[PDB]
Design a protein around this motif. Sequence first.
Motif, PDB file in Angstrom:
ATOM      1  N   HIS A 136       9.418   5.317  -1.572  1.00 15.44           N
ATOM      2  CA  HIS A 136       8.534   5.098  -2.712  1.00 15.44           C
ATOM      3  C   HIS A 136       8.766   6.103  -3.834  1.00 15.44           C
ATOM      4  O   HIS A 136       8.299   5.874  -4.955  1.00 15.44           O
ATOM      5  CB  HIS A 136       7.071   5.139  -2.266  1.00 15.44           C
ATOM      6  CG  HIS A 136       6.557   6.518  -1.994  1.00 15.44           C
ATOM      7  ND1 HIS A 136       7.271   7.450  -1.273  1.00 15.44           N
ATOM      8  CD2 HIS A 136       5.399   7.124  -2.350  1.00 15.44           C
ATOM      9  CE1 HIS A 136       6.575   8.570  -1.194  1.00 15.44           C
ATOM     10  NE2 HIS A 136       5.435   8.398  -1.840  1.00 15.44           N
ATOM     11  N   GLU A 137       9.468   7.205  -3.566  1.00 16.87           N
ATOM     12  CA  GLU A 137       9.817   8.137  -4.629  1.00 16.87           C
ATOM     13  C   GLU A 137      10.804   7.471  -5.579  1.00 16.87           C
ATOM     14  O   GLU A 137      11.721   6.766  -5.145  1.00 16.87           O
ATOM     15  CB  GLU A 137      10.392   9.442  -4.061  1.00 16.87           C
ATOM     16  CG  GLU A 137      11.911   9.533  -4.014  1.00 16.87           C
ATOM     17  CD  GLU A 137      12.403  10.624  -3.085  1.00 16.87           C
ATOM     18  OE1 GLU A 137      12.001  11.791  -3.272  1.00 16.87           O
ATOM     19  OE2 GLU A 137      13.197  10.315  -2.173  1.00 16.87           O
ATOM     20  N   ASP A 192       0.858  -1.172   0.000  1.00 20.84           N
ATOM     21  CA  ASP A 192       0.000   0.000   0.000  1.00 20.84           C
ATOM     22  C   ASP A 192       0.898   1.227   0.000  1.00 20.84           C
ATOM     23  O   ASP A 192       1.980   1.201   0.597  1.00 20.84           O
ATOM     24  CB  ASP A 192      -0.913   0.010   1.239  1.00 20.84           C
ATOM     25  CG  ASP A 192      -2.335   0.452   0.935  1.00 20.84           C
ATOM     26  OD1 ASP A 192      -2.542   1.616   0.538  1.00 20.84           O
ATOM     27  OD2 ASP A 192      -3.253  -0.379   1.096  1.00 20.84           O
ATOM     28  N   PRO A 193       0.488   2.314  -0.661  1.00 19.63           N
ATOM     29  CA  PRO A 193       1.248   3.574  -0.541  1.00 19.63           C
ATOM     30  C   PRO A 193       1.004   4.276   0.791  1.00 19.63           C
ATOM     31  O   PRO A 193       0.708   5.472   0.856  1.00 19.63           O
ATOM     32  CB  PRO A 193       0.743   4.381  -1.745  1.00 19.63           C
ATOM     33  CG  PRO A 193      -0.605   3.854  -2.039  1.00 19.63           C
ATOM     34  CD  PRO A 193      -0.610   2.410  -1.639  1.00 19.63           C
ATOM     35  N   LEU A 194       1.128   3.515   1.879  1.00 18.77           N
ATOM     36  CA  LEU A 194       1.022   4.041   3.232  1.00 18.77           C
ATOM     37  C   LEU A 194       2.379   4.375   3.837  1.00 18.77           C
ATOM     38  O   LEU A 194       2.441   4.770   5.006  1.00 18.77           O
ATOM     39  CB  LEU A 194       0.281   3.047   4.138  1.00 18.77           C
ATOM     40  CG  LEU A 194       1.048   1.888   4.787  1.00 18.77           C
ATOM     41  CD1 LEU A 194       0.143   1.142   5.757  1.00 18.77           C
ATOM     42  CD2 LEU A 194       1.628   0.929   3.760  1.00 18.77           C
ATOM     43  N   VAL A 195       3.462   4.227   3.070  1.00 17.14           N
ATOM     44  CA  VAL A 195       4.795   4.488   3.600  1.00 17.14           C
ATOM     45  C   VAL A 195       4.944   5.964   3.943  1.00 17.14           C
ATOM     46  O   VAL A 195       4.516   6.850   3.193  1.00 17.14           O
ATOM     47  CB  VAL A 195       5.869   4.026   2.600  1.00 17.14           C
ATOM     48  CG1 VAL A 195       5.787   2.522   2.397  1.00 17.14           C
ATOM     49  CG2 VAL A 195       5.710   4.744   1.267  1.00 17.14           C
ATOM     50  N   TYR A 196       5.540   6.231   5.103  1.00 17.96           N
ATOM     51  CA  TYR A 196       5.747   7.588   5.587  1.00 17.96           C
ATOM     52  C   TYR A 196       7.115   8.150   5.226  1.00 17.96           C
ATOM     53  O   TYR A 196       7.428   9.278   5.622  1.00 17.96           O
ATOM     54  CB  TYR A 196       5.552   7.637   7.106  1.00 17.96           C
ATOM     55  CG  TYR A 196       5.751   6.302   7.785  1.00 17.96           C
ATOM     56  CD1 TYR A 196       7.025   5.824   8.062  1.00 17.96           C
ATOM     57  CD2 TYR A 196       4.664   5.517   8.150  1.00 17.96           C
ATOM     58  CE1 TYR A 196       7.212   4.603   8.682  1.00 17.96           C
ATOM     59  CE2 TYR A 196       4.841   4.296   8.771  1.00 17.96           C
ATOM     60  CZ  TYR A 196       6.116   3.844   9.035  1.00 17.96           C
ATOM     61  OH  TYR A 196       6.298   2.628   9.652  1.00 17.96           O
ATOM     62  N   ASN A 197       7.931   7.402   4.490  1.00 11.98           N
ATOM     63  CA  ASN A 197       9.282   7.817   4.135  1.00 11.98           C
ATOM     64  C   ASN A 197       9.390   7.927   2.620  1.00 11.98           C
ATOM     65  O   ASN A 197       8.470   7.534   1.895  1.00 11.98           O
ATOM     66  CB  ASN A 197      10.316   6.839   4.688  1.00 11.98           C
ATOM     67  CG  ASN A 197      10.602   7.061   6.160  1.00 11.98           C
ATOM     68  OD1 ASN A 197      11.176   8.080   6.547  1.00 11.98           O
ATOM     69  ND2 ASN A 197      10.204   6.104   6.992  1.00 11.98           N
TER      70      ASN A 197
END
Lengths: 143, 343
Positions: free
Chosen positions: B92-93, B84-89
């Motif tokens: 994912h960029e 999920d794109p729930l990553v806080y860092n």
Amino acid sequence: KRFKAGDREVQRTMLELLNQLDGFQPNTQVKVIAATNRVDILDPALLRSGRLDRKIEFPMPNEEARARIMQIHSRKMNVSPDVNYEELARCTDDFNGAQCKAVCVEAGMIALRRGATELTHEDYMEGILEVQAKKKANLQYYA
Amino acid sequence: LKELTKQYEKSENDLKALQSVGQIVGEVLKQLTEEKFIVKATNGPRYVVGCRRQLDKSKLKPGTRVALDMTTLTIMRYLPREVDPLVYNMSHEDPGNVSYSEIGGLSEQIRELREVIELPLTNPELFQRVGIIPPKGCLLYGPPGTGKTLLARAVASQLDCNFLKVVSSSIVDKYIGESARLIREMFNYARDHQPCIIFMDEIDAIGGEGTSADREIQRTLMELLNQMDGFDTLHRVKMIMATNRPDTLDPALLRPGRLDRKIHIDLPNEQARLDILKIHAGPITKHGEIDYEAIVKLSDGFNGADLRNVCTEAGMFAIRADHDFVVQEDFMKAVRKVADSKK
Ligand SMILES: Nc1ncnc2c1ncn2[C@@H]1O[C@H](COP(=O)(O)OP(=O)(O)O)[C@@H](O)[C@H]1O
């Protein structure tokens, strides 16, 4: 910005928003815009290529801009033909556009208090003095 | 009959499905014995749960997602890790598929950065054959906007590894301990996702005295140096920590296994301006000949981003016009407005 607290709900909203800005590529007719008065607290992840980008810069109006802005928000009001909007701009400094409209509103209100139809320059000056809550007292030591 | 045959088989599959029932998604957190587990539901209590016979015991490691039956409360099958794109860092960029040729005129500096970072991540056999622990960390210093971040993205693209970009000035927060906490979370994050390019922005805020706020910068500096070189896992992730003022940097922050190799990236070189204009203006359609030397002489003290703004703004001038780039006067006025209006 990011920080199990109760903010983990708006976080999903922001991440879903980020997902949709990066989901759609340019050259389509889905141009987005966003407005905020504080980008200091904005997550820079929102301000990344593919996301919003192209940060438009909104400054406090300068003297000529302040005079023009004060001119627009008085077109619907019976302002006297002899009102030096330029001098009004000189006397209005560190003033945002909202205050540059509030000065016109307060000038009209003070004119109503004085029981006059057209707004004189003195009404606008008293609006400038009253938009910042200042009260004008004739100090004796100037003369 | 045939279309009826197909839709009737589908309807019978649906009829069988109606009998089928759901499983609560759970996560294994411990393994007591070879038939005992401690599985926690996504939003629910923790149950002591067994495993189905047609299931490998080994695969259910602490952290393996499972879908147990919701009546017998027994694991039926494993599930891979939730995505999920729930990553806080910033992992994912994507740095973007930009080659080393995109950044122009840094050939020497590009080569040193490749030798420092690309070598330990691609071919560590040289370093282990020599007998030296592979170097980790390169320090890029130069005028702002010169393209250090672009260089980091180019390395992260060629190496095809996850890339973290961070504004170091943002990480120093007024509240105590969060400045070092951000570095701590960053490094433990890089531990899970490997290999990692930890590109840190202007370090002069973090790297380089009688007050609490000043000792906070000392504490976050010690946390940083402990994270790079020290205990736990010496790890394989690399850092592209870049600064604007190199003299401010702490001497301990410049060590071989501790972010060595001060690469100097000065303002675009005299010949580099031509290459930068070639790469950033070539994509722009322009049939007219170019007097690049004249633009380079008219752009003195320019930085890499300025040339890209020149190209984009020349395109804008074309937009406010016919559509085709034909004349050098456009590049001249673009340079001037990227000179006076960007001051
Ligand atoms: N040497 C260069 N060659 C090509 N493009 C450059 C160069 N330097 C800067 N740029 C352009 O400027 C943009 C931003 O530069 P950036 O990486 O932020 O510079 P810095 O890392 O020095 O802040 C990039 O998108 C890149 O296209």
